[PDB]
């Protein structure tokens, strides 16, 4: 059961004497036992993709054929750790080796075996009680926040024969057993699941509840849904990573799984250094945000093939936690890197390029990655509800949104956040374009936003109208030179300037806009729209009769009120009370009303 | 260790461009170094690339010319490319391949190291925080650089980036002020003789030759060696960073020539292309080069890196600058408009970027309002450029007052903030005082970005 390395070139090798083999079967190569995978074959020859540096491998080295395709281990202890692209626990490696490198072909299990997790019985089962796939028969407390829950694997069912009592056990101790049809099979705390296979689910349900967002923009103007899709393409210098981190820190989701791909090392250094300090409570004590976050690091240098594995691994973990009834939120970084890794690999096989060298099937691969999402009714008796949201970050080469990868992405996603490098040159954080972006989910959420607020639709519509009309007037004021302006035109242009500078701008590090909840957004938009309405009504009435009000007149009338209006954003809601800011904005509206009455 | 004798060969199945193919090889090893003896007795080397069956392929480093099948001899060593490294290498000169130039002897080595190095574990990475004093206000003040950073410098043909690099070397230090210094390794990627003379003389001038290792590859040398030289220099840097606990600064120059050499070597194999004909995996290769930098837990040294590249035809979408902009976390963008106005040092700020500033500065590092000054100054600069572009059409009559304020701000800021001089080295606090001197021109009721508090406590004076 050993092949021999016929050839080697790049990360693609060849092995003869492998007639008894199958595609996508893992494989160990060389004396370091680098993990691999099968892609092609011809007779008793085969082609092995290698997930590790090939330097030093020699012809004729033994190659061990294993008995399973690519798989990922699931169970307690996954939370809070950081894994590389094929799921080696990095912290275990650094502890074991006492070094600062990653030796090639290091073999350490995905999870630890020498830890005793507390276990609780089902409290509802007995000897001879029948279950099926996806039924919970155990609860283990990883920590105060997230209570792990062990379910029977899919494709298994039967009447139980032994249940372990409550107490502290490790993985290796057999927990459950059962007979189905005269065969007794034992279940541990560990599931092994093929990575490229979807976890079955009862039924996909329609979306029913939105997804909170940190930033002021991209929340009112382009909402997201609890289970939907979103994309953030944009040229460099624009910093998609800041938005990704901001979303990661501040969101109502129960688990966050932030998969990096080809990222910078310093960015993972940010994440590791920074998340543990931030904290938040739910039903008592305050606990660090690291206690609800699982990371999958994969920086640029790491072997090219591993980039493929990492993304699939991450989404698989997301689905596994989805089978618990949580609301997972996932953050993919630079899927363009994944596409480019696939491009390189397919290049070294001597296959057909399709579009800019990208193989044809990348569109299908991308679509398959995203379609595993959405809110779903789960499979199991206890009747759990959960969802998975996916927000991926594309990196078009140079900002050209006609490149193949963005073109394939725009057809499949539902929400799109175009970003503009000019704004990022202005440091207009976040540098979103607000004119080519869109989001098809507005219609499904209007019902919610009415069942809570009922006073947002006019605000949004008027904001879109004013911005659109400003953009139309941009050409007319550019060519003319700001002379051929009726007073309403100047009013809309300058109120558009104020909304762009005030509501749209937001700093992503200063304490007072690290986070901004929805109500403040509503308050600010209401203030600005009301001011627009009053200004135009006054100017209309004074235009038709006599003494047409120029914009300079209202400016000199209430520049102080304008200054207060803009400085509204200095609040830091964390300390100050909500009703206090509501009364503050009501007071500013009172000031505006008084000024307009005095001018009236 | 290995006592196996080294086989020699006489099999040359055939030549095709820069490749040399061998046959009847007993167990070749991927990426093993091989020496070649030509009929004339002169010597060369190479590295295996593709192996299949008993056949193998060998990239020649010195350029293939004069290879005869029946008289050449191909000696094999049986290991990857491995280099000698020693602390005393500082204060020497070497060519691209590593052989001495300065009439000295080869390096008695303290250890052998892998040319490619090997990835560092992200968990044991101490994020860089400590700030460096460059002196240039366009960096300290706008795009500050902390040790461990790997920011590049973008230039164009016929621009004085060499002067900027030399000055950066001269005035490097620590803003927070035993006497600390630097150990600088410098590698050249096809510079002309004039550049080499300039850099060598400059390092001679300030007495810093005692602590600089040099790597020089003029255009005379065969292009294939340009692939290896960077990784060799970078390996030396890593040794001095983690085995001697020194603080090191790296300066690779004209990586555009490196990209050209990469294109040349790739075209021999007929790999798949990308934009402008470069290899697709060129991105991953540049990543293999650039990333090797930063500070690691449990140590004391650190690696800073300052690559320099020219922009062909000033086209910023060109693949080399783009992929550099993806990998590294910043840019500088030397301007040529200022060079046409005869200004020194002519550095644009509007497209420059420094990702590490968000933690480089703050209270207890430089000053309380360091970020605010930066934000407001950039904003005024941007609106000033916009107002100039507007003035180019409408005429002076259409200008409102704030246009005049922005234009005088633009002029004053350009002649004051940017212009420093060949050796003027401003302190950081002097730079902030000057920045506030430029901010005070505007009335306080227009500096939107700055918080109200900072304006209250600092603006009136």
């Amino acid at each position: 059961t050993f092949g021999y390395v016929h050839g080697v070139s790049g990360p693609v090798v060849t092995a003869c004497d492998m007639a008894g083999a199958a595609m996508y079967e893992l494989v160990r190569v060389g004396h370091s036992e680098l993990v691999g995978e099968i892609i092609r074959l011809e007779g008793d020859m085969a082609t092995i993709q290698v997930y590790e540096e090939t330097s030093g491998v020699s012809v004729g080295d033994p190659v061990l054929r294993t008995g399973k395709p690519l798989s990922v281990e699931l169970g307690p202890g996954i939370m809070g750790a950081i894994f590389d692209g094929i799921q080696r626990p990095l912290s275990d490696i650094s502890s074991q080796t006492q070094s600062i490198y990653i030796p090639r072909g290091v073999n350490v299990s995905a999870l630890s075996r020498d830890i005793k997790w507390e276990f609780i019985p089902s409290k509802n089962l007995r000897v001879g009680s029948h279950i099926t796939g996806g039924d919970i028969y155990g609860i283990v407390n990883e920590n105060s926040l997230i209570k792990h829950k062990i379910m029977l694997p899919p494709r298994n069912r039967g009447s139980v024969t032994y249940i372990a009592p409550p107490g502290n056990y490790d993985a290796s101790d057999v927990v459950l057993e059962l007979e189905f049809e005269g065969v007794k099979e034992k279940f541990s705390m560990v599931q092994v699941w093929p990575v490229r296979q979807v976890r079955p689910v009862t039924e996909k349900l329609p979306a029913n509840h939105p997804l909170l967002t940190g930033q002021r923009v991209l929340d009112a103007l382009f909402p997201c849904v609890q289970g939907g899709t979103t994309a953030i393409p944009g040229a460099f210098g624009c910093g998609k990573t800041v938005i990704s981190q901001s979303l990661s820190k501040y969101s109502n989701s129960d688990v966050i799984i932030y998969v990096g791909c080809g990222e910078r090392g310093n960015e993972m250094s940010e994440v590791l250094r920074d998340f543990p300090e931030l904290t938040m409570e739910v039903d008592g004590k305050v606990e660090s945000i690291m206690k609800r976050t699982a990371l999958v690091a994969n920086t640029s240098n790491m072997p090219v093939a591993a980039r493929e594995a990492s993304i699939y691994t991450g989404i698989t973990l997301s689905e596994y936690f989805r089978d618990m009834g949580y609301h997972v939120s996932m953050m993919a970084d630079s899927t363009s890197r994944w596409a480019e890794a696939l491009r390189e690999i397919s290049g070294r096989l001597a296959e057909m390029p399709a579009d800019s060298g990208y193989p044809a099937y990348l569109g299908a691969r991308l679509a398959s990655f995203y379609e595993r999402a959405g809110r779903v009714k789960c499979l199991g008796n206890p009747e759990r509800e959960g969802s998975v949201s996916i927000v991926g970050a594309v990196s078009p080469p140079g900002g050209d949104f006609s490149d193949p990868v963005t073109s394939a992405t725009l057809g499949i996603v539902q929400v799109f956040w175009g970003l503009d490098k000019k704004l990022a040159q202005r440091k207009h954080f976040p540098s979103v374009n607000w004119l080519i972006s869109y989001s098809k989910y507005m219609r499904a959420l209007d019902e919610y936003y009415d069942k809570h607020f009922t006073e947002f639709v006019p605000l949004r519509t008027k904001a879109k109208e004013i911005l659109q009309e400003e953009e139309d007037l941009a050409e007319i004021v550019q060519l003319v030179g700001k002379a051929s302006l009726a007073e309403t035109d100047k009013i809309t242009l300058e109120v558009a300037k104020l909304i762009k500078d005030d509501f749209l701008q937001q700093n992503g590090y200063t304490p007072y806009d690290r986070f901004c909840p929805f109500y403040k957004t509503v308050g600010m938009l209401s203030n600005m729209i009301s001011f627009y309405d009053m200004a135009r009504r006054a100017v209309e009435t004074t235009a038709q009769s006599d003494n047409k009000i120029t914009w300079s007149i209202i400016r000199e009338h209430m520049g102080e009120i304008l200054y207060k209006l803009s400085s509204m954003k200095f609040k830091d809601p964390v300390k100050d009370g909500e009703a206090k800011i509501k009364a503050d904005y009501a007071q500013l509206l009172e000031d505006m009303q008084n000024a307009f009455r005095s001018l009236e | 260790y290995l006592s196996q004798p080294r086989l020699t060969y006489k099999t040359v199945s055939g030549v095709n461009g820069p490749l040399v193919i061998l046959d009847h090889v007993k167990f070749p090893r991927y990426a093993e170094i091989v020496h070649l003896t030509l009929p004339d007795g002169t010597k060369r080397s190479g590295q295996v690339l593709e192996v299949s069956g008993s056949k193998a392929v060998v990239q020649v480093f010195e350029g293939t010319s004069g290879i005869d099948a029946k008289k050449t001899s191909c000696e094999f060593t049986g290991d990857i490319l491995r280099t000698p490294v020693s602390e005393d290498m500082l204060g020497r000169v070497f060519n691209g391949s590593g052989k001495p130039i300065d009439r000295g002897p080869v390096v008695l080595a303290e250890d052998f190291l892998d040319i490619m190095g090997q990835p560092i574990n992200p968990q044991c990475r101490i994020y860089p925080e400590e700030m460096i004093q460059t002196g240039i206000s366009a960096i300290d003040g706008m795009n500050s650089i902390a040790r461990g950073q790997k920011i590049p410098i973008f230039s164009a043909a016929g621009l004085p980036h060499n002067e900027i690099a030399a000055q950066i070397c001269r005035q490097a230090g620590l803003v927070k002020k035993s006497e600390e210094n630097f150990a600088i390794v410098f590698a050249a990627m096809g510079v002309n003789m004039e550049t080499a003379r300039f850099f060598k003389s400059d390092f001679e001038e300030n007495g810093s030759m005692d602590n600089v290792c040099l790597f020089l590859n003029l255009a005379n040398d065969p292009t294939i060696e340009r692939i290896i030289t960077p990784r060799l220099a970078l390996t030396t840097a890593e040794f001095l960073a983690y085995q001697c606990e020194k603080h090191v600064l790296v300066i690779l120059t004209d990586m555009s020539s490196y990209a050209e050499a990469l294109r040349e070597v790739s075209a021999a194999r007929e790999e798949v292309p990308g934009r402008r004909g470069f290899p697709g995996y060129m991105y991953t290769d540049l990543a293999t080069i650039y990333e090797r930098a930063g500070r690691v837990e449990g140590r004391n040294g650190s690696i800073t890196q300052i690559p320099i590249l020219t922009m062909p035809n000033d086209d910023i979408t060109h693949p080399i600058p783009d992929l550099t902009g993806y990998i590294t976390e910043g840019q500088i963008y030397v301007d040529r408009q200022l060079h046409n106005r005869q200004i020194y040092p002519p550095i644009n700020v509007l497209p420059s970027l420094s990702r590490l500033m968000k933690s480089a500065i703050g209270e207890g590092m430089t000053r309380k309002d360091h970020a605010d000054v930066s934000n407001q100054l950039y904003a005024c600069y941007a609106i000033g450029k916009d107002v100039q572009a507007m003035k180019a059409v409408v005429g002076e009559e259409a200008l409102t007052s704030d246009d005049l304020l922005y234009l005088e701000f633009l002029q004053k800021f350009e002649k004051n903030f940017i212009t420093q001089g060949p050796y003027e080295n401003r302190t950081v606090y002097e730079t902030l005082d000057i920045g506030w001197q430029l901010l005070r021109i505007f009335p306080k009721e227009m500096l939107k970005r700055i918080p109200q508090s900072t304006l209250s406590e600092f603006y009136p004076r």
Binding site: A350, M352, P353 | E270, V272, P273
Partner: peptide, 13 residues
């Protein structure tokens, strides 16, 4: 151009 070249090369076998 390149893809045609690769067809040409493949046809040699």
């Amino acid at each position: 151009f390149y893809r045609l070249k690769k067809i040409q090369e493949k046809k040699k076998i």
